[PDB]
Design a protein around this ligand. Structure first.
Ligand SMILES: NCCCCCC(O)(P(=O)(O)O)P(=O)(O)O
Ligand SMILES: [Mg+2]
Ligand SMILES: [Mg+2]
Ligand SMILES: [Mg+2]
Length: 340
């Protein structure tokens, strides 16, 4: 059961949870990968990794993915959480130089991951290992798009470093634009495609119904995270959260800001339901009688289905993951799974 202030009856009633059959192996394989790549201290991996639920989150999202595709996605996603923690710790400890060098290495390793598979920086080497594997599933045109999108994410993280070290809370609208990048909306959208085994042509993925359904799936996930991660983020001096922008720039109380975020999250659901019809109608029209049309139609259908699965996977993740359980920590500003 979910607390009333975080509960979304439409998710519970109309977005039934799904789980990929590979999840039991995925859980352990990603945990062992975090161990062997030295991405988190060994004792923190053993105490906290399974409870963090990072593999559950991806196994509830990319249904139908080949096991090896899901494994690369889950390793990358676990890496992404660790990167979010390293970024936080670099800000808290004022390690501007360490962050700038990491930012530069990630840009280089994103373009040529093979060259960085054995880099002395374990966070860079782990990044490169997951990215090299992701680059092996589809043609190089998809790899270049993933790279374009993630270069932008890195720079959004750099903007967040600038904001936090200066004490800048972005305006609401500025935040909403930045949040499509710091949440990596377009990376999760790109990853739908190796999960269904088909690189979509630009004309298909840029169709207004596909693009809007993909956007709303990610807006829901990012803003629902804002809602559920607000307590940990206030405690940790994080400034990036729709609720914090609302409190800071529109004088809302905490109760008012929580209600406003929850309403925006609710609207993403019912807006998505409307555009999902259009996206599935588009899928049907792609089935033009040809083999290629059937392939594209099935790929779009699977991708839209996973856009929908993201809603339920993100919803339950936030109530299962130890990542958000600030009330249980000795120091609410320093989560126990973070290397301080
Ligand atoms: N899909 C999860 C992306 C990882 C980003 C981490 C967060 O969502 P973010 O820093 O983006 O708010 P969290 O609230 O857990 O710190
Ligand atoms: Mg964070
Ligand atoms: Mg972050
Ligand atoms: Mg958050």
């Amino acid at each position: 059961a979910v607390p009333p202030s975080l509960r979304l009856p439409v998710i519970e009633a109309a977005f039934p949870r799904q789980l990929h059959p590979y999840w039991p192996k995925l859980q352990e394989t990603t945990r062992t990968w975090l161990l062997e790549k030295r991405l988190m201290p060994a004792d923190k991996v053993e105490e906290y990794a399974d409870g963090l639920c990072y593999t559950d989150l991806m196994a509830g999202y990319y249904l139908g993915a080949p096991d090896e595709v899901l494994q690369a996605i889950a390793d990358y996603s676990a890496w992404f959480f660790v990167w979010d923690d390293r970024h936080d710790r670099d800000i808290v400890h004022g390690r501007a130089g360490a962050w700038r060098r990491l930012r530069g290495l990630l840009h280089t390793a994103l373009d040529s991951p093979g060259d960085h598979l054995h880099h002395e920086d374990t966070l860079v080497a782990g990044f490169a290992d997951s990215v090299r594997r992701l680059y092996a599933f589809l043609p190089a045109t998809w790899n270049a798009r993933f790279a374009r999108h993630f270069h932008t994410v890195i720079e959004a993280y750099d903007r967040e470093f600038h904001n936090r070290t200066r004490g800048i809370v972005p305006g609401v609208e500025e935040y909403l634009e930045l949040r499509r990048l710091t949440f990596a909306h377009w990376i999760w959208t790109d990853l739908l495609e190796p999960s269904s085994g088909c690189e979509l042509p630009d004309a298909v993925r840029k169709h207004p119904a596909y693009r809007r359904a993909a956007l709303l799936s990610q807006e829901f996930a990012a803003w629902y995270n804002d809602l559920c991660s607000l307590p940990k983020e206030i405690a940790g001096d994080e400034v990036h959260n729709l609720g914090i922008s609302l409190i800071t720039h529109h004088s809302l109380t905490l109760e008012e800001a929580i209600g406003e975020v929850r309403r925006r999250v609710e609207e993403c659901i019912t807006e998505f339901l409307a555009v999902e019809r259009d996206a599935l109608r588009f899928a049907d029209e792609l089935a033009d009688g040809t083999v290629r049309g059937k392939e594209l139609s099935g790929a779009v259908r699977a991708n839209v289905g996973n856009m929908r699965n993201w809603f339920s996977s993100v919803y339950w993740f936030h109530h299962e993951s130890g990542r958000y359980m600030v009330d249980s920590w000795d120091d609410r500003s320093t989560p126990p799974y973070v290397n301080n």
